Design a protein around this ligand. Sequence first.
Ligand SMILES: *[C@H](C)[C@H]1/C(=C/c2[nH]c(/C=C3N=C(/C=C4\NC(=O)C(CC)=C4C)C(C)=C\3CCC(=O)O)c(CCC(=O)O)c2C)NC(=O)[C@@H]1C
Ligand SMILES: *[C@H](C)[C@H]1/C(=C/c2[nH]c(/C=C3N=C(/C=C4\NC(=O)C(CC)=C4C)C(C)=C\3CCC(=O)O)c(CCC(=O)O)c2C)NC(=O)[C@@H]1C
Ligand SMILES: *[C@H](C)[C@H]1/C(=C/c2[nH]c(/C=C3N=C(/C=C4\NC(=O)C(CC)=C4C)C(C)=C\3CCC(=O)O)c(CCC(=O)O)c2C)NC(=O)[C@@H]1C
Ligand SMILES: *[C@H](C)[C@H]1/C(=C/c2[nH]c(/C=C3N=C(/C=C4\NC(=O)C(CC)=C4C)C(C)=C\3CCC(=O)O)c(CCC(=O)O)c2C)NC(=O)[C@@H]1C
Ligand SMILES: *[C@H](C)[C@H]1/C(=C/c2[nH]c(/C=C3N=C(/C=C4\NC(=O)C(CC)=C4C)C(C)=C\3CCC(=O)O)c(CCC(=O)O)c2C)NC(=O)[C@@H]1C
Ligand SMILES: *[C@H](C)[C@H]1/C(=C/c2[nH]c(/C=C3N=C(/C=C4\NC(=O)C(CC)=C4C)C(C)=C\3CCC(=O)O)c(CCC(=O)O)c2C)NC(=O)[C@@H]1C
Ligand SMILES: *[C@H](C)[C@H]1/C(=C/c2[nH]c(/C=C3N=C(/C=C4\NC(=O)C(CC)=C4C)C(C)=C\3CCC(=O)O)c(CCC(=O)O)c2C)NC(=O)[C@@H]1C
Ligand SMILES: *[C@H](C)[C@H]1/C(=C/c2[nH]c(/C=C3N=C(/C=C4\NC(=O)C(CC)=C4C)C(C)=C\3CCC(=O)O)c(CCC(=O)O)c2C)NC(=O)[C@@H]1C
Ligand SMILES: *[C@H](C)[C@H]1/C(=C/c2[nH]c(/C=C3N=C(/C=C4\NC(=O)C(CC)=C4C)C(C)=C\3CCC(=O)O)c(CCC(=O)O)c2C)NC(=O)[C@@H]1C
Ligand SMILES: *[C@H](C)[C@H]1/C(=C/c2[nH]c(/C=C3N=C(/C=C4\NC(=O)C(CC)=C4C)C(C)=C\3CCC(=O)O)c(CCC(=O)O)c2C)NC(=O)[C@@H]1C
Ligand SMILES: *[C@H](C)[C@H]1/C(=C/c2[nH]c(/C=C3N=C(/C=C4\NC(=O)C(CC)=C4C)C(C)=C\3CCC(=O)O)c(CCC(=O)O)c2C)NC(=O)[C@@H]1C
Lengths: 172, 172, 172, 172, 162, 162, 162, 162, 216
Amino acid sequence: MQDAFTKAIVAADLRGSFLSEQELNQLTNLVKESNKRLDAVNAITGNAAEIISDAAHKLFAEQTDLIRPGGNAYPNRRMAACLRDMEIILRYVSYALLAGDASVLEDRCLNGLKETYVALGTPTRSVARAVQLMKETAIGYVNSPSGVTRGDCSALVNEAATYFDKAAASIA
Amino acid sequence: MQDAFTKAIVAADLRGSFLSEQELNQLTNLVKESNKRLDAVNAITGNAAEIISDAAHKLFAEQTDLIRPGGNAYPNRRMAACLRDMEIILRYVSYALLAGDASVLEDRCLNGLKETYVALGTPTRSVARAVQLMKETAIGYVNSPSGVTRGDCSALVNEAATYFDKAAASIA
Amino acid sequence: MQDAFTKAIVAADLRGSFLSEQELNQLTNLVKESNKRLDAVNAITGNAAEIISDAAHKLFAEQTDLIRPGGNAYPNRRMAACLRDMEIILRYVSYALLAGDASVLEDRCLNGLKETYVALGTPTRSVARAVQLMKETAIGYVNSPSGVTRGDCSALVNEAATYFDKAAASIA
Amino acid sequence: MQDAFTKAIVAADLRGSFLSEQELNQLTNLVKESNKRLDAVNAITGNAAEIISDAAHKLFAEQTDLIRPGGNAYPNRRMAACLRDMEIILRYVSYALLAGDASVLEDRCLNGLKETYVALGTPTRSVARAVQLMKETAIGYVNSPSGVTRGDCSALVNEAATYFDKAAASIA
Amino acid sequence: MKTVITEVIASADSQGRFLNNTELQAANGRFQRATASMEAARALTSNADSLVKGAVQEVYNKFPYLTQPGQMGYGDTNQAKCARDISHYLRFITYSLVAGGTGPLDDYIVAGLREVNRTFNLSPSWYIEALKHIKGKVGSQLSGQPLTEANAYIDYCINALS
Amino acid sequence: MKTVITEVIASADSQGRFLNNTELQAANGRFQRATASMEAARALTSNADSLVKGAVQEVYNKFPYLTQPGQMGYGDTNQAKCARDISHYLRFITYSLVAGGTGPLDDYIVAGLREVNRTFNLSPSWYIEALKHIKGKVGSQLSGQPLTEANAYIDYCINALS
Amino acid sequence: MKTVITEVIASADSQGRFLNNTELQAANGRFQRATASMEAARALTSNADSLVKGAVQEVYNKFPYLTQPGQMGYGDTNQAKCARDISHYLRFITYSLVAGGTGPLDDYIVAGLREVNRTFNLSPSWYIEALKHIKGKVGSQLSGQPLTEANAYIDYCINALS
Amino acid sequence: MKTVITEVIASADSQGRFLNNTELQAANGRFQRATASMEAARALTSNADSLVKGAVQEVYNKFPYLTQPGQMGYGDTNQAKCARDISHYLRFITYSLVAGGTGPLDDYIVAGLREVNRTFNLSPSWYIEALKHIKGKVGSQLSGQPLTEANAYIDYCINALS
Amino acid sequence: YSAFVRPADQATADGAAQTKLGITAIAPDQGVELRPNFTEADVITVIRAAYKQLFGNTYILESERVIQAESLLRNGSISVREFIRILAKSDLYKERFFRCTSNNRFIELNLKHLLGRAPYNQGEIAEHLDRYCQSGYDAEIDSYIDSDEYRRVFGENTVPYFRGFKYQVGQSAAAFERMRALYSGDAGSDTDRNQNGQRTELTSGLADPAQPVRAR
Ligand SMILES: *[C@H](C)[C@H]1/C(=C/c2[nH]c(/C=C3N=C(/C=C4\NC(=O)C(CC)=C4C)C(C)=C\3CCC(=O)O)c(CCC(=O)O)c2C)NC(=O)[C@@H]1C
Ligand SMILES: *[C@H](C)[C@H]1/C(=C/c2[nH]c(/C=C3N=C(/C=C4\NC(=O)C(CC)=C4C)C(C)=C\3CCC(=O)O)c(CCC(=O)O)c2C)NC(=O)[C@@H]1C
Ligand SMILES: *[C@H](C)[C@H]1/C(=C/c2[nH]c(/C=C3N=C(/C=C4\NC(=O)C(CC)=C4C)C(C)=C\3CCC(=O)O)c(CCC(=O)O)c2C)NC(=O)[C@@H]1C
Ligand SMILES: *[C@H](C)[C@H]1/C(=C/c2[nH]c(/C=C3N=C(/C=C4\NC(=O)C(CC)=C4C)C(C)=C\3CCC(=O)O)c(CCC(=O)O)c2C)NC(=O)[C@@H]1C
Ligand SMILES: *[C@H](C)[C@H]1/C(=C/c2[nH]c(/C=C3N=C(/C=C4\NC(=O)C(CC)=C4C)C(C)=C\3CCC(=O)O)c(CCC(=O)O)c2C)NC(=O)[C@@H]1C
Ligand SMILES: *[C@H](C)[C@H]1/C(=C/c2[nH]c(/C=C3N=C(/C=C4\NC(=O)C(CC)=C4C)C(C)=C\3CCC(=O)O)c(CCC(=O)O)c2C)NC(=O)[C@@H]1C
Ligand SMILES: *[C@H](C)[C@H]1/C(=C/c2[nH]c(/C=C3N=C(/C=C4\NC(=O)C(CC)=C4C)C(C)=C\3CCC(=O)O)c(CCC(=O)O)c2C)NC(=O)[C@@H]1C
Ligand SMILES: *[C@H](C)[C@H]1/C(=C/c2[nH]c(/C=C3N=C(/C=C4\NC(=O)C(CC)=C4C)C(C)=C\3CCC(=O)O)c(CCC(=O)O)c2C)NC(=O)[C@@H]1C
Ligand SMILES: *[C@H](C)[C@H]1/C(=C/c2[nH]c(/C=C3N=C(/C=C4\NC(=O)C(CC)=C4C)C(C)=C\3CCC(=O)O)c(CCC(=O)O)c2C)NC(=O)[C@@H]1C
Ligand SMILES: *[C@H](C)[C@H]1/C(=C/c2[nH]c(/C=C3N=C(/C=C4\NC(=O)C(CC)=C4C)C(C)=C\3CCC(=O)O)c(CCC(=O)O)c2C)NC(=O)[C@@H]1C
Ligand SMILES: *[C@H](C)[C@H]1/C(=C/c2[nH]c(/C=C3N=C(/C=C4\NC(=O)C(CC)=C4C)C(C)=C\3CCC(=O)O)c(CCC(=O)O)c2C)NC(=O)[C@@H]1C
């Protein structure tokens, strides 16, 4: 796989050099944030079931047809899949968030996904929509926890967003 | 898979409706013919070996080269394959005939068949020919049996033909 | 595998003889009962879930320990297994009932079941108990259905019993 | 698998009780030693290759026959095995040492080992000997490291021993 | 999709052999029965609606609290859905009668049943009642084999739900 | 052994599911047919002998040279065997009618047919004639469905032999 | 059973390599955290009972009808069970805190959760409330990391239940 | 590449489950340690060169004959290479400290070490000395945990080489 | 509201049952699946596993290991089931783990190495025995990985696992008993090189009438 640290290494390797002092200071700082980083992840995982449940409800209220005969979320079998999918994407996103790198998400999850969806006749648009719906709910938790020391998580929040968005984009 | 009944269902499903009374009456009558339908199938299966044997003889009387060194049916090994193939196709056709639907035949059997033949360098034309040869012999039995209650099987006979022909066409 | 018909055949084979007229009349009558036979099976399958559910409740009311910490049905994971098992046994029994022969049941389901149970440390006795509990409930349905033409099912009822019992015995 | 913590849990479970305060204090203290515990492991892993190399030399100086034609360590093939084996055992021992529990070692490593050795014709006694040879060398490192804060590791040292010995015993 | 006809083909196909007498016998069975099956379907199809109303209703009697505010049974949207859903179950049942196999049921309703229900917190119980109530009504309009068939399928779901 | 009943069980078993309506429908088919099947068996069983004589005989007419010295058809031992064998074929056929499946045939006759025949240099052709001649005779004593059934099975062998 | 320590061993074992620095780092993490974990456990263990009462109770407020005759919540046996069960959940949670892994939870509670619940018609919902109510109480007796830990595990179940 | 963080993800991923508390604990460990790790790297990076010179040198003292004509240690090209190589080892070590895992080492240095060395007739021994000499020097510039970390990794290679 | 809980009598627990059989985590199996983008390490771990599962758990020397099959995994172009086909088509497996043991022996051991199950019935063992002369050995092993259930579970991109010693569907009796015989202790492994040569753990005698009994 890859993650923030490993990445920087790899770059350095091809130059053939020891790590730049500048570059260390990226990682040094990254460390400092860890604690924040972690809690973020924890928040997602903790609320997982809900995040999904929620997003779904809203997805189906919007695009009624998906659940109607002839739509893509009908019948049960399909419905199930659609739920499962959302979850998966989420799972990955989380992973990334911890790693501090998109890769894992892109490689295992997003790669080829669009085409699959196309071949099946799944409407890519709707999938993307769902991803966002999820995003917002998720951030909701990340950003409003209880019993955590109060401070600024923005930096992490935005990175979270980006991950969701890469997802949305590549699916769409 | 699919067959006549299942099919009608599926259609109805996408409309989102119960089966129309009109539509039932298609199936109701289809049932009535069963007995005829069955015997037809029985006749094929009963004579199977022969049908093939026969068709082959005629195939090779026509296209002498197939059996000559450098041809496609030479040597033994190849010959064997060619016989086997014919049989298979037949097998499927039968299946369809029972189901009351092309699908099974198309999906399991015909799909990709042409391409195979191409890749091998098997002359698609000749294959098609064989299929017909078979067709005629087969009908021969379907239509002239022993101990069966005398009646009109035409309807079934024609449907049989069609199946053979879909085969011929998609191979060719 | 085996069943009532096949069985009689096999016997006849070893004698080297055509079937006795007497012997035919066993099978002839067996046929007549079919309809009854079938409904019996149908009743079990129809109520399956319940039969089990019921039996379990009673099993655990009796042998409190099984469900207590350190017992064999504790914790959840184990519990699950124990339920699953009961079901299986039932499933088989049904099979037999249709066939009109113990064999199927004996071979796939019963043979070496005891030993398994032993190796695991599961108390064979309790298993057997459950089987009976099931038996009684099952018969309950077989014998008291709704919308069926009223007549005598005893013959079948008893044969059902026997199957259950072979089970009980070989487990125990 | 199992380890010190998990173990205590399991015990508590069968009693059907919450963890004793007394019992917590076993684990609480166990934690405190962690740092020591860790370094111990680190020392083994760090010296691994050598520990073995060493032990072997001594093993073969003692039991000359093993390396002579007809012996068990001859020819190369066998020799290799014997080396590999030693290593494995070691590997496990280490694992245990970290876990704070014999189990892991007993189950994966020692279980069935005697019987294997028997079937092969390997002289169990010699194997045991090797294990000890290893033990002593290993302790050597555990107990005399460089750059570590000075303190008492005896407690750990002895537990280490025991693991080695369980090995020796069950093989022998 | 699992029907008598499809299966025998499948089995024949797997072994790699022509449909022989064995299978045809089986098929014949399906066709003979159909006459009864078909009848049942015509009966359900006609009374659909009325069955649906009755069922939905029942559920509420059985579980009053559902109709209270803040619950699932509350507010028309949900009621509409509840209706729709049961319609579906029925729809499929008819299908299955006609197809002469559980197939239709399996693929639409059963497969993925659990997870759907879990994620939306639909209690199987409810559906069940619906069905039972139905079964009871059906037990008047039909009789003999037609009836028997109707039951089988209805139940099959009960069992799948539970 | 392959009969209708055994198969559905098998299929049910593989999937790991209870016998549902689907399979029972199939079974029913087998049972309804049996009445005809059974009749046919009673007819063959009775005329057995006569059919056998006629067949054996036929074969010799068809292949005169067999009866010449130094051939297979020659010398009583061989004739006895020839008789025996055909008896068997018949025997099994009856069985299969009753069992309601090809099963009996498959396991006794068909499986390993080729190699046996190869190693002892029995020409399939012969048997075939026997059968055909039989089929022709049977085509008098029987009628309607009973007949149809008889044929199916007889043929099934022809096809297996060839 | 899944704890930090067991896993790294497992991973090390699979690859067939000694525990190197990589794994130890991980282990160290578990140990540092333990101090907080341990604290939490001591707090839950002590107030156990009171938490249990409160939860059970809550459930009934949330779902009044349960206490009505002919329901599940009704009649002492059931109440006893209900109590027992929740106790368990709690018990395990403590365990898991101490073990430093979900392991204990997974193997006792989670594995087979669904089917148990299905066959006995226990609605996950109930348990959930119990937990939530608990979580709320715990959110007073504890603070900082100790708290955080407590939550994690409690939740983990919520998610498994739902 | 194997680091703490990557592994837990991997394991989580395989099972198909979310990262739960178990893994996070592990991660936390990695992060706490990093501060020491990072320090060590800064120290090695700075003194690199000097360490390298010293090592190369050492090797020659240890194995005088290498510097004789017709040997490997002889002629500048070889000396240059020898230097380069050790630089590499060092480089990677730093990497690994920072990455918080053996990963970097494994993939660059270790995998395929043997065969390379065999085909070019590089004696592991040599490298080893280099390392040891290094380790000794490092044992001055560093202290406490920073040191400990440095060692671990240095060794890990010794073991891989031997 | 008694909330009598109590230690109970037996006090078996989760763990004790399996330790009694001695599975020590062989019965529980965690499948390993390859990915189109994978670390070389991830390929290594797969190779590691593959070797064990299909081999006796016997020692494998670097010389023994076939590098050409290992090459290609990194590349792609070899399905992991096809990778596993290359092994056993290997001389290594045929000359050792095939020659010594009787036809019955390797059938059971294949059926173990390639699939967790021990053989449910005498007839299916016989089916492969029909093949021995019927067709070339390579076909018969090919037939196993080509068999449906190999495909059904861990069909593609998955190392085979000893799913035996848990409930698998359609296990005709003595699943556990036979498997108990066929798996020694976790450390213990079938040995190409062994005293008394190599004989079938499972009694030829049985496979129909009784459950097997074997040293553990
Ligand atoms: C960010 C979205 C929100 C937020 C986060 C936040 N957390 C901390 C500090 C800590 N958080 C943890 C949590 C963990 N560390 C671990 O090792 C684990 C896994 C076992 C967890 C769950 C820890 C230990 C700390 C340090 C001590 C403490 O929290 O008291 C901060 C403070 C800054 C820092 O980086 O230390 C912040 C801001 N707080 C919010 O309100 C945000 C919405
Ligand atoms: C016979 C009428 C003619 C003929 C056929 C022929 N076929 C092959 C080889 C193959 N043909 C097939 C057949 C099928 N593949 C499928 O998927 C299906 C349906 C399930 C069929 C009908 C395939 C796949 C092969 C390749 C593998 C095989 O063993 O068959 C050959 C031999 C090819 C070769 O190069 O040896 C032949 C000859 N060709 C003739 O000469 C006839 C006109
Ligand atoms: C059609 C190609 C030829 C023909 C057929 C024909 N068949 C019947 C009637 C029946 N045929 C069957 C046969 C089967 N039913 C089964 O269940 C099976 C499998 C065991 C078979 C093989 C049956 C049972 C019947 C009903 C009774 C009977 O045999 O008469 C008819 C009569 C009309 C009808 O639709 O039933 C006919 C015409 N006859 C021809 O002239 C064609 C050459
Ligand atoms: C339930 C009535 C009693 C009980 C049973 C029980 N069984 C297990 C575990 C297993 N049971 C089996 C049995 C089977 N193998 C087969 O071939 C068949 C059908 C022919 C069956 C029914 C198997 C294989 C297992 C082991 C693997 C698994 O657990 O899935 C348990 C669990 C105990 C354990 O640790 O394995 C139990 C509880 N015990 C009770 O509590 C009841 C009295
Ligand atoms: C015995 C425990 C119970 C019982 C059964 C009973 N059934 C019948 C008759 C029939 N039952 C069926 C049912 C089927 N036949 C099939 O083909 C299938 C598969 C699709 C089924 C499920 C049928 C068709 C009949 C014939 C008509 C009828 O329903 O009566 C009887 C009558 C006697 C007999 O069949 O010989 C009886 C007695 N009756 C009892 O006492 C129990 C309730
Ligand atoms: C025992 C056999 C010998 C010994 C050990 C010893 N260690 C410490 C203290 C520490 N050891 C470590 C080491 C680790 N902690 C980790 O997290 C890891 C993995 C990344 C390791 C390798 C740490 C961090 C400490 C704390 C600081 C320190 O080094 O002192 C002590 C001090 C007492 C204590 O309880 O920690 C001792 C005695 N020292 C010897 O002389 C023994 C032969
Ligand atoms: C009736 C007893 C209760 C009720 C029903 C109800 N259903 C939903 C939501 C869904 N219902 C289904 C069920 C099906 N959809 C299908 O496609 C099929 C198979 C053909 C079935 C059986 C599904 C899939 C859903 C999920 C989302 C959706 O349907 O759009 C709800 C809403 C729950 C929510 O939170 O969204 C309700 C309320 N209504 C009542 O009043 C009863 C409690
Ligand atoms: C009759 C058309 C011709 C004939 C036949 C004949 N058969 C054999 C030998 C065998 N024939 C069979 C056939 C069967 N035996 C069985 O058990 C079964 C299945 C129930 C069948 C169908 C077999 C197995 C043999 C080989 C062993 C044996 O001795 O029976 C012979 C003798 C040839 C020899 O060399 O042994 C003959 C002559 N006899 C004729 O005159 C016809 C040409
Ligand atoms: C509380 C909200 C509800 C309640 C509980 C209740 N439970 C049962 C039965 C069982 N409860 C469990 C749960 C567990 N058993 C375990 O081993 C574990 C893990 C440690 C759990 C969580 C189990 C196993 C059962 C089923 C078997 C049994 O007999 O206990 C019942 C009785 C159900 C019955 O049909 O006998 C009840 C009532 N009681 C209430 O009032 C709420 C609805
Ligand atoms: C120094 C201890 C001795 C020495 C060095 C020397 N090395 C080679 C050749 C190679 N050494 C390596 C080492 C590396 N190359 C890499 O890419 C890596 C990992 C990043 C390492 C550690 C390799 C791969 C080679 C082979 C390729 C090459 O030779 O360029 C030589 C050359 C030997 C020859 O050409 O036969 C030498 C001389 N020489 C000394 O003075 C010391 C004894
Ligand atoms: C070395 C100190 C002594 C020694 C070793 C030795 N072992 C074997 C053969 C085997 N070793 C094992 C053991 C294990 N299996 C495992 O999985 C593990 C770790 C969990 C171990 C340790 C096995 C199964 C074998 C069989 C290998 C095979 O069949 O190829 C031998 C060779 C004997 C043989 O004929 O194979 C030897 C030499 N024996 C000595 O002589 C030393 C005293």
